[PDB]
């Protein structure tokens, strides 16, 4: 609605100066048809050369001073509309990033892509271009009608009777032609979706010898267009006929009335030239304003999707305010039970209770599924638990500050995504301040990535493209490990650290886990399927069915001959 | 260069079968130009008549010739656009079909290397940009060039002294238009680069949000997107400042030449060498001769982009496919002996990286064969080489004591079928997808294929039976049902050598095995690809695959 479109209020001093310069430019532009009727009346009755000189210098100044004020008026408006479009586009990106995490799973990424990138840039650029054109020609359409009344009312009134009678057939056929033009463009783009569907699955088409069948399916879509295209081409010829004939018939209607009036001595022949020159300029200001208005109406129709996206409220609780200086690192679970809110009918996790302490390693093991990685999601404040209480150093997680908590809790994902940036900054991602050069080298030392990254031709400044093309799965693990080691997290989460690690960095992983001097201020949660690290863990728990089944230390559990005995003998 | 000359003649050979439409369209072009140019000549002749008597023999002749040429200009211009819009549509549909047919025969290494974003732009947007050459860019250029000569032909007839002053300011109007059109295209290219740069920032943040929230860098990604917009905003303002500066130059210059000719033309008319009628005919032409030079320079700039956008398509269409010569051997005796003899394959996109290292084995028609190996060993590449999808670098593949590339393309793929590792379902109906690639079949075989592959049980849950429409990409049905549809797609064809590639697909491999022992009949070769050894047994023989070497 226009009321919700009441932005750009802070710039109302700049926009008012624009509105005072468009009217001053519109008044000084119409001097040209005024001083052609005074010259055509000067020649018809002679006169001094002073009046020739005086009429030329007033047309000299007013036409020059009308082009300058348009140029000052144009840039002003273009300067301010650049700021409003850019400030709002950056404002809609802050809203989506503050939405809940569950917005970003079921709904497609490309749907979020369209609403931010070109459903706002092309919406604003179409509206800012089509609003000034509506604003420029409305004042010229209003300032021309003012002097038409002052000139002669008799020929002015006969324009307004014949105007809507002559501007119904051009827009009735004009409506019919643009209907057929958009039916071609829909069927042309529909056939492109069929052709690109078969091209993206070429191994499937080739293995069934269906190259002839896909050529026939495309030829059926194109043969449908040609049937409706002959009728569309005729409708372009009729539309060009009606616009041309109705425009020309208007010109001869006003000339006959004026010629009868000017031969009766009522008005001079000078005033007829001014009026006819105003007739074409007033008509053009109407037909331009008639074509701009549907485009502006279309743009504000699509503006309700952007503002609904900005006005929706997140479901996640807001960030806390507490930033304590030092953290001990204790975290405990109090009978928690998490369910995915996308399908809350299924309890993924239930009845979980364990405590972690600095200096001890707790390993979570189990089969595929059964909510293995879901426990890591709840720890780093990605979802809220449906049941139970979660405590970090005696305090709940959402009570803590958002940026400080993630700086003290670091995790390694199942498939660690990498972004296309400099690897010096990619290692030091997300820090409040840029660290010095020593810490990145020390992080590469403690991660085992230094043996490979130093062999690059650029080294720490080696650029990486999208989706991690110039790296191996093992090198993707090593680059992620150093990312979680700079900030020195009080609680460290290790999920699938050795999925593709069978080298010296795996030895550095267990060296950091079990014999590094800094383990006494860190708590580690470990989820890998390698049993070599499990047997040295201080605490080992079994996860199956989203609940705790067996527990205790390592040596306490084979003597029970429980589930740990199963895959060891296998 | 001569490269543009061949693109001139190749684009003209494309529009040869539209000869009767171009002749009728180019007739109406010439008829309309002569109609409009004579209108201002009769305008001044009426005024010169309007200084004497109202004699019918000259006044009524000039009025009648006014309305005849006004009718002649408007009626012909309507039929010119009617015959040119139909011509562009016929060219657009001709080059879309011809390109898509030529893109369909390329080797499989072409589609792996080429992104799908580029092929969509060539098909959808570049074909439109090349069909605008003859009906639009050569139409406007020819219409404006004839009209400009016609206007200066009459100006020389009116006053040879006055028309020389029009030629003096001309070289500025050509130079100013050529400079602005060069600068405007340079900015609009830089807009396209910086727009996709800002969309690259939101590319990483939205898709990989889980890594973003894991490190608390939401305010960091907002900061980088706010900075990437400031680079776009500087270029948006630069385009609008240059555009609004060019209009101010054009408006001052237009007034400048109007005063030079109103002053000097009046001084000539007071000396008796010009009449009031010939002055009015001179002034109407002069306002029109400036607006046609600007159109002529602008269009000729755009004609070079139409050829440049037509050189990407003509390079995709003329690229030679890397395929073996087609075979015509289709014996009816196809008992199905498959022999591998020291095969070695390297991917064409990534050469000198061997996958196979001299594999050799033999398949017997009446038995069951199983392949087992680790992930990434190359089991699916053996499936691809068995269907003539590639050429092995070394060795050969022998089918019935013949090389596999020596058979007919339609006959071989109707006898050696497979089920893909990741099934793909198209946008047709269910009945159209089971009988995919089949020229003619009855409804009984489709039902029977669903019965054998356990696809008829869930086919009656949703209405219309087997005529139900499937959504695009197959995103309407369950993942487990998609493998059952893919399996039934193989069996309806009545194949001879059967390949099943479930691999990571489970929880249905025992539903197929329990009914039929991997659908082994006794004269149909069956190859089953699995990851675990404890799963087959059924197979008469087993060949483990490790790093491209059998054990």
């Amino acid at each position: 609605v226009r009321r919700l479109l009441g932005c750009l209020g802070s710039e109302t001093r700049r926009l008012s100066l624009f509105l005072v310069l468009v009217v001053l430019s519109s008044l000084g532009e119409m001097a040209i048809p005024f001083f052609t009727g005074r010259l055509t009346d000067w020649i018809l009755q002679d006169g001094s050369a002073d009046t020739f000189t005086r009429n030329l210098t007033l047309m000299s100044i007013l036409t020059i001073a009308s082009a300058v004020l348009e140029f000052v008026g144009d840039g002003i408006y273009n300067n301010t509309m650049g700021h409003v479009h850019s400030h709002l586009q950056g404002e809609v990106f802050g809203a989506v990033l503050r939405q809940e995490t569950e917005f970003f799973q079921q709904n497609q990424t490309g749907n979020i892509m369209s609403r931010v990138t070109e459903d706002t840039s092309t919406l604003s650029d179409s509206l800012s271009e089509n609003l000034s054109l509506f604003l420029w020609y409305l004042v010229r359409g209003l300032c021309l009608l003012g002097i038409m009344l002052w000139g002669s009312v008799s020929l002015t009134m006969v324009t307004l009777i014949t105007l809507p009678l002559l501007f119904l057939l051009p827009k009735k056929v004009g409506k019919w032609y643009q209907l057929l033009e958009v039916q071609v463009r829909e069927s042309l783009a529909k056939s492109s979706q069929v052709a690109i569907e078969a091209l993206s699955a070429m191994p499937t088409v080739r293995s069934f010898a269906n190259e002839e069948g896909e050529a026939q399916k495309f030829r059926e879509k194109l043969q449908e267009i040609k049937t409706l295209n002959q009728k569309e081409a005729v409708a372009y010829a009729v539309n060009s006929w009606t616009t041309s004939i109705s425009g020309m018939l208007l010109k001869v209607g006003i000339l006959y009335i004026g010629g009868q009036l000017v031969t009766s001595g009522a008005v001079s022949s000078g005033n007829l030239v001014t009026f006819v020159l105003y007739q074409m300029q007033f008509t053009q200001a109407v037909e331009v304003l008639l074509s701009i208005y549907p485009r502006v109406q279309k743009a504000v129709g699509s503006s309700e999707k952007i503002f609904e996206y900005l006005d929706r409220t997140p479901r996640c609780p807001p960030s806390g305010l507490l930033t304590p200086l030092h953290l001990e690192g204790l975290v405990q679970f109090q009978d928690v039970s998490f369910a995915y809110p996308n399908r809350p009918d299924v309890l993924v996790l239930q009845g979980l209770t364990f405590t972690l302490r600095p200096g001890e390693v707790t390993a979570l093991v189990g089969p595929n599924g059964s909510g293995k990685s879901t426990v890591a999601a709840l720890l780093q404040n990605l979802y809220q638990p449906t049941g139970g209480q979660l405590l970090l150093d005696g305090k709940p997680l959402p009570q803590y500050e958002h940026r400080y908590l993630h700086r003290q809790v670091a995790a390694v994902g199942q498939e660690p995504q990498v972004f296309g940036r400099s690897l010096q900054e990619n290692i030091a991602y997300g820090l409040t301040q840029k660290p010095t050069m020593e810490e990145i080298t020390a992080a590469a030392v403690k991660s085992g990535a230094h043996s490979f990254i130093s062999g690059l031709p650029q080294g720490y400044d080696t650029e990486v493209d999208e989706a991690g093309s110039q790296l191996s799965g093992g090198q993707r693990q090593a680059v992620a490990l150093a990312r979680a080691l700079i900030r020195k997290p009080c609680v460290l989460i290790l999920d699938d650290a050795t999925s593709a690690l069978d080298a010296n960095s795996q030895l550095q992983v267990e060296q950091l886990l079990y014999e590094s001097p800094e383990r006494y201020s860190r708590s580690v949660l470990l989820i890998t399927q390698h049993l070599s690290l499990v047997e040295q863990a201080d605490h080992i728990l079994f996860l199956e069915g989203g609940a705790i089944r067996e527990g205790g230390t390592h040596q306490q559990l084979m003597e029970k001959k429980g589930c740990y005995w199963a895959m060891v003998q296998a | 260069q001569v490269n543009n000359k061949v693109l001139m003649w190749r684009l003209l050979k494309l529009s040869r079968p539209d000869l009767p439409l171009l002749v009728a369209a180019f007739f109406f072009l010439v008829l309309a130009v002569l109609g409009e140019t004579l209108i201002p000549h009769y305008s001044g002749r009426v005024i010169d008549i309007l200084g004497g008597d109202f004699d019918p023999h000259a006044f009524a002749s000039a009025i009648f010739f006014m309305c005849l040429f006004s009718f002649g200009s408007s009626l012909s211009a309507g039929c010119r656009g009617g015959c040119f819009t139909y011509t562009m549509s016929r060219i657009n549909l001709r080059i879309r079909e011809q390109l898509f047919s030529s893109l369909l025969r390329q080797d499989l290494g072409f589609f792996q290397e080429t992104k799908t974003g580029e092929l969509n732009s060539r098909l959808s947007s570049d074909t439109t940009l090349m069909s605008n050459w003859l009906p639009l860019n050569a139409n406007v250029l020819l219409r404006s060039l004839v009209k400009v000569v016609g206007l200066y032909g009459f100006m020389l007839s009116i006053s040879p002294r006055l028309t020389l002053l029009s030629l003096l300011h001309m070289p500025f109007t050509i130079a100013a238009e050529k400079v602005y059109n060069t600068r405007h295209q340079e900015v609009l290219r830089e807009i396209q680069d910086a727009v996709a740069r800002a969309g690259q920032v939101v590319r990483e943040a939205v898709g990989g949000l889980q890594t973003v929230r894991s490190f608390g860098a939401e305010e960091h990604e907002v900061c980088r997107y706010k900075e990437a917009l400031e680079q776009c905003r500087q270029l948006y303002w630069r385009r609008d400042l240059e555009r609004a500066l060019y209009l101010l130059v054009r408006r001052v210059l237009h007034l400048g030449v109007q005063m030079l000719m109103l002053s000097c033309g009046l001084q000539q008319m007071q000396d008796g060498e010009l009449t009031q009628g010939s002055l009015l005919s001179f002034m109407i032409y002069q306002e029109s001769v400036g607006s046609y030079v600007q159109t002529l320079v602008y269009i000729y700039g755009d004609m070079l982009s139409n050829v440049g956008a037509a050189e990407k398509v003509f390079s995709y269409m003329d690229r030679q496919p890397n395929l073996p010569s087609p075979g015509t051997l289709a014996p009816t005796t196809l008992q199905g002996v498959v022999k591998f003899q020291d095969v070695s394959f390297a991917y064409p996109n990534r050469p000198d990286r061997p996958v196979l290292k001299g594999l050799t084995f033999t398949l017997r028609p009446g038995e069951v064969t199983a392949l087992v190996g680790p992930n990434g060993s190359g089991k699916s590449t053996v499936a691809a080489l068995l269907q003539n999808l590639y050429q092995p670098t070394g060795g050969q593949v022998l089918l019935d004591e013949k090389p596999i590339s020596q058979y007919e393309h339609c006959y071989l793929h109707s006898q050696v079928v497979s089920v893909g590792q990741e099934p793909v379902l198209f946008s047709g109906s269910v009945r159209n997808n089971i009988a995919y690639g089949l020229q003619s079949c009855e409804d009984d075989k489709v039902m029977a294929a669903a019965q054998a592959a356990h696809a008829d049980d869930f086919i009656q849950e949703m209405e219309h039976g087997i005529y139900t429409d499937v959504g695009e990409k197959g995103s309407q049905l369950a993942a487990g049902q998609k493998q059952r549809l893919a399996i039934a797609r193989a069996l309806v064809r009545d194949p001879r050598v059967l390949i099943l590639d479930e691999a990571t697909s489970a929880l249905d491999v025992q539903c197929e095995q329990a009914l039929q022992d991997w659908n082994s009949r006794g004269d149909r070769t069956v190859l089953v690809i699995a990851h675990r050894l404890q799963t087959v047994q059924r197979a008469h023989q087993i060949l483990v695959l490790q790093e491209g070497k059998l054990q």
């Binding site: 348009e70 144009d74 000034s132 054109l133 420029w136 020609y137 372009y236 060009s240 331009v288 701009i292 | 211009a77 656009g81 040119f84 819009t85 562009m88 009906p135 639009l136 139409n139 406007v140 609004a244 209009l247 159109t295 269009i299």
Partner: peptide, 9 residues
């Protein structure tokens, strides 16, 4: 600003 009519075909 000034409207520029798309070119006639």
């Amino acid at each position: 600003r000034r409207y520029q009519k798309s070119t006639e075909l």
